[PDB]
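Obj.: predict assembly geometry.
Materials: sequence records (below).
Method: joint structure prediction, all chains together.
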Amino acid sequence: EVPDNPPNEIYATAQQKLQDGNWRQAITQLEALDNRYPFGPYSQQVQLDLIYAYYKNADLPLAQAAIDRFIRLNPTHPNIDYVMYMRGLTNMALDDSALQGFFGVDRSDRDPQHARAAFSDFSKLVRGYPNSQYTTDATKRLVFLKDRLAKYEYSVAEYYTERGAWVAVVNRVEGMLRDYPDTQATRDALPLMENAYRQMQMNAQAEKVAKIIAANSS
Amino acid sequence: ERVVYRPDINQGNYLTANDVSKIRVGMTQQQVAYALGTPLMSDPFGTNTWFYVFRQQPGHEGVTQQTLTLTFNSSGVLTNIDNKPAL
Amino acid sequence: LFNSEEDVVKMSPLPTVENQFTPTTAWSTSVGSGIGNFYSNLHPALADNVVYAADRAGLVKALNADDGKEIWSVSLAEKDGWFSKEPALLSGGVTVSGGHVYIGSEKAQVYALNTSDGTVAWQTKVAGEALSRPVVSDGLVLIHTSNGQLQALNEADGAVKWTVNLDMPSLSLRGESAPTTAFGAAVVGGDNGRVSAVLMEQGQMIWQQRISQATGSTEIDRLSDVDTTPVVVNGVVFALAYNGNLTALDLRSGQIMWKRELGSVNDFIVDGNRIYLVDQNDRVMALTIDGGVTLWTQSDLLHRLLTSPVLYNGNLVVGDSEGYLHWINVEDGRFVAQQKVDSSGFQTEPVAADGKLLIQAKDGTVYSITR
Amino acid sequence: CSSDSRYKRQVSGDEAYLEAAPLAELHAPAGMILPVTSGDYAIPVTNGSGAVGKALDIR
Amino acid sequence: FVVKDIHFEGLQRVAVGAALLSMPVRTGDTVNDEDISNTIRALFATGNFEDVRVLRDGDTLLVQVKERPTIASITFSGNKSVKDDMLKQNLEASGVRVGESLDRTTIADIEKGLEDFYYSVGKYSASVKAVVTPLPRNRVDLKLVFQEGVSAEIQQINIVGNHAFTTDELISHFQLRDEVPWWNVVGDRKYQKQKLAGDLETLRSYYLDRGYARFNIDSTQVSLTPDKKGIYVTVNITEGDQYKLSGVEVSGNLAGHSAEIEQLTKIEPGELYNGTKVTKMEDDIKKLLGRYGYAYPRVQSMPEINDADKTVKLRVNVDAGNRFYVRKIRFEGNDTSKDAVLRREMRQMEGAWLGSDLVDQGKERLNRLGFFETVDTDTQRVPGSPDQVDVVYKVKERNTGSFNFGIGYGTESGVSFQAGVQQDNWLGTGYAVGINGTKNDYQTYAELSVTNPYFTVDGVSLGGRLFYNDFQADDADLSDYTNKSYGTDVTLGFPINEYNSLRAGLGYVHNSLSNMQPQVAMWRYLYSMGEHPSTSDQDNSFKTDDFTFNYGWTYNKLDRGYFPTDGSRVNLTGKVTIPGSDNEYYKVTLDTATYVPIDDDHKWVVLGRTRWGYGDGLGGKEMPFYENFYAGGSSTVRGFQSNTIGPKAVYFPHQASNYDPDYDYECATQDGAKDLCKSDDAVGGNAMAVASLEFITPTPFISDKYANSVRTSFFWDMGTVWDTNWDSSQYSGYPDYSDPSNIRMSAGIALQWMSPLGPLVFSYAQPFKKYDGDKAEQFQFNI
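Observations (raw structure tokens):
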């Protein structure tokens, strides 16, 4: 950190190490800048530049720590849309990260743990600030995590298909049904649960859903 | 294919014959659900068809099911006790 | 290096070693290992040239007090129960009242050994082991046991006359309350820092005076057994509460004349108005009886784990649980004589009786002392 | 560092989360339709201010 | 008066205007002298102004304040094994921390409560000295000096009120084997009041099972010994006349399973009372009803202790609840591995009633997985109907995969290297993938071992293992023992029991060799084959295409998948040849892994790992020499070198390896060492008996963050590898290995570092009983 110094030379060295990309040395400045001066005139911007130092150094719980600091330091601020962006943006990096993506192996169906948390913050962002510079960005992520939930919830419906729990197939399909309409995976879940009906010999209850397939052919 | 062993596939969510005699055509959904609760599958887009369907597979000896579906009206009043055996 | 780099506790030595009247021992007649390093209330009595000394191992002895020649000897090491062949394990000390040797044991038994031979004239199981010496008087065996029970046994047979509650400590806040008969009322100490007077005749509370408080948020002495037993000169009762808190208070009401709620004293005797004591730093002090006025004090003993202060050979005599003996001026702290006759440390009070100074150690048992 | 061939930290990273597009939704009538959204799925799709992706300020 | 202006003197965290609003004498407001006195307490009510002196210059106010705020640091000195943050937790209890108001008056408040903390430790012999050390503008370093004297130690237990049982049997509620005489110091018997309350309830369970149902600990009095260490006690109890179970009258909502409940309460009327068994017998019903559904099986016993016949009467009040509870289940802590990998390790199904014994069995496969850190769940009822209990399987998962390598032979030599890497749980799918091999000039070796462990719904372990050794031992020729060994091994693992699981396979052993080394034990096998290669020369070819039938069987009753602690897994691995194979032989092998708890808290656990093997011909021939057994170095026995345990062969008196290099790689060859040179590498025996005896111990110098995943373990190794068909005529001046008395020996400690690349095992071991050819590097580094 920084010893007891003038705050602006700490703040200059904070913004230098952000422009240097030395996020740790910006973290060295910005925290001790707010450790002695949380009453700083940029101490709100410090917490934003902390998240800028944290996320660009991929310090995801520390970015969320600077979020909850900024929640406590600025419970009202213009940049809470930034916070509701940097909440959902952090959890997206917090949910799934792997180098296997070029091989056709992806983590979009393993567990949407922080992806559901990123869904909440981003949907809060596009609800609490549908005017920000962050609500337009978050929407395609909210589009994305809906699919990441759709990839997740199809595979468990796929799991009980090889298991043979056909009540669980219909329930996990209805999990896709009752949560997001705008997914082809839910549309392919539409034959998947009527199979479960026919394995339960509910062919009549099945073919109602084939009409829904006939309805959702478009 | 020519095995005797197989780990069995099992599946609850059903009702008994005591639960069959617990209900009758005319019974409200709640009056079914007083001692039977809700099924773990119902009919979402149509009328209330309370699916209490037993399923099980015995290992390399056939298949079994008790499909007991309980259709209700819009008022949730019982219209059929539809017990169905295997296949 | 790290054979010796472990933890360490701090103490203080024994300054001012003097021998102005060159001391010695009167005799040794060792009972064996007595109390030992166990924390017990056992302590021998000396009378009639009969050293009434015992051990928790079992050997209760009568020793002829010029050499401690064996008058009688028995063994209270018991032989049966749910465990056979056990030692005596005496909790309460030696009380010889009449032809009995009344001793409360850690087997929750109060005995009475026929003083002619030491044969058990009676023994009675009491409610818990005896935290105090069995204060035997008036036909009663007045004990402060572990559970805060003032009991009375008919001292001829041990027939229980009552068993009534006292200041019950939150733990074994081990304080000898030792209920003595004081002017027709049994005046009892308190292990939670109280002090009480009850009726001698049936244990009917004259008053109980809350002086000091229990362990917890004013945490009290686990570096001493505070002499909570009220020593009763005329009806200003002088007593410690379990933080060492000396208190001059009325016999009949418990109303304070002065008290040392601030003061923390290990052991104490009232030599007239010169209350000779052992302070919490093992310091000797002479306090007044009309106040906490230090008449004199001394640090010739400091962290020297003293026994009770006693007057013998014209001097304030003090032994310790280091095994030293010290003779102090009756006045201002002049160390008179030092006798290192023990190394096992004295855990008993000095008995300045039979012309002697009878102290039984933990393991260096009876060392009777003269100068 | 890569002090041998000077080939530094290279090809990685993506923004496919922004590049994801929603899919076809249910066109089912009554008796074929059910409730379709339940949860935090409440998103005002706003081109209220854009500058999406890496061009957005994360400071 | 009225204030002209206020001098705001000394804030350190307060603002000037924030002091002005907290002043009731703010600028422009009427200021009486009482409002000045109102200000002092109100600026004392700020919690940050150590002094407040509200003064005025006639009317111009000036408030002399010394201030309380930010503590610069809190220095802990003497902050030993009783760690400083819990000491700081008392500072966090007393309101002080870095950044905060200090209030230097409250030092003794901290200096009491830290001792009261030290009181609760098991000490009281300690002193705490908080030192104020000033830093800029108010700031203070809190130097805290911990002169910790000593803790308390358990010495003696005195219990009165014992009716018929010994106090000493209650002293044994905590176990001791230690001593401190300055020459046998192995620990002590220190005090904690929760050891006592544990021993109190050990004493409670001590008499409940006896029958004592007037049993009550009357009171307890623990000593105030004048040392602050000596732990003596006076416990008052009443055992009270052991009672008998004279009848069970279980009642309530028995859910139609009352006879099954009666099976759990099949009791004897008049047997001595065991409330712990009764406590067990209630739990028998709660799992039976838990297997019958009924996740909330309220079962309430009532031992109507019948004091007249000195017995009890066991009323039990049962309330099962609802049968169907398992609506669905959830899974969490799963962001990398696929859900159906863990979901197939489950036995309770969604849309069902509860089998209580299914959810832990599924978790046991998850416990026996290995790439978990924790395995647990959240069995929450979804609120509403009594059909909605969603079991949220939140677990913690561990890294998968590990890389292995050799040593040396690179960048100052040819293109030559040793490789090998593992991807068990391949990319979150569960595929057990292990692939190794090495491309050198001596040899080109290929090996894959890939499994579909779960290929059907049975859990069929579809495991394929392919191999190709283009092994030449190419030093300057391949006529120093060419060996082209290749083929396949397809294996399947099957549930028979779910502990007892059988294995089977086929080996295609295509070994194409030329110009065999003249060691006799290799060539005795060739003579056992009926082949007569020319003794003094490495010139003779030998191709075999052996067709073997492999088999085996797994025992699996043992806790975890990567760090178990109790149980055993026994692993038979055997093989035999078939008619049509180029040699008729067999080879049986077995390894076991039993986990016997030394400590019943499993801080010390016996690890019984031993290997047995025997192989021979099916008639006329023997087992091939490359299938003979070995040990040494990287084996059960450490501190040796690899293949240094076993029989050692003798070369033939030899001339022509088709040119062994000059005075290099000798086989009693043309370049010297002739007339039956005894080889010193362990050519190994047709039988095996090796073992290592490992004992798990934790480390306190490293925190137990991964010291429960780091298996520090001592050993003493013993074992033999021996050829029970060793000749005594051919090997007469050469050691006879027909006996299993060739028991090698070593002793040392293993160092298993669980890296992000998995466990890394290092081992220094000292051999004490060795034999001929036992080459020994006392440290063994393994990956």
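Conclusions so far: Chain D touches chain B at residues 28, 31-35 (CB under 8 Å).
To do: check interface contacts against the pulldown list.
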